[PDB]
Structure formats: structure tokens, C-alpha cells
């Protein structure tokens, strides 16, 4: 309520790529990229794995952020 939540959770996803990636996961529609990236993956580039646990988690909480939280 006084700051963000998964936002920085992504801010930490190695600024290299996993960062802007995980952001992608919980940034675009709940399935805008979470899918095209966590579904039709060819060789698991990077945002799909990072942002897959980061996008899925974002969902788990964002829906009813109250219990524990995954990535």
C-alpha cells in the first residue's frame, strides 16, 4: 500500500535479462506474454523461465495477494 510488490520482485530479476523479462510476465496482460513466452518457447530464451515463475506468481498473489507467494 505504501510501495510496490512484484514490481521490484522483478526489479531484482538479474537486470541482465531476467529483469525486464519477469517484468514482461507481470507487466503485459495476464496472458499477453505469459503465454507466447511461457508456452510456445523454442529453447527457453530467458524471459520465459524467469518471467514464467515471475508471471505465474504475480497471478497467484495479484488475484488475492494475501497468502504466501511464489517467484
Amino acid at each position: 500500500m505504501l510501495q510496490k510488490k512484484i514490481e521490484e520482485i522483478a526489479a531484482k530479476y538479474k537486470h541482465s535479462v531476467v529483469k525486464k523479462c519477469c517484468y514482461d510476465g507481470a507487466s503485459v496482460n495476464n496472458d499477453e506474454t505469459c503465454e507466447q513466452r511461457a508456452a510456445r518457447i523454442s529453447l527457453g530464451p530467458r524471459c520465459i523461465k524467469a518471467f514464467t515463475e515471475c508471471c505465474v506468481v504475480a497471478s497467484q498473489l495479484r488475484a488475492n495477494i494475501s497468502h504466501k507467494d511464489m517467484c
Binding site: 531484482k12 530479476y13 538479474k14 531476467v18 529483469k19 523479462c21 530467458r46 524467469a50 506468481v57 517467484c71
Partner: peptide, 4 residues
């Protein structure tokens, strides 16, 4: 989730 993390990549490094």
C-alpha cells in the same frame, strides 16, 4: 524466476 531469477536469471543469473
Amino acid at each position: 524466476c531469477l536469471g543469473x
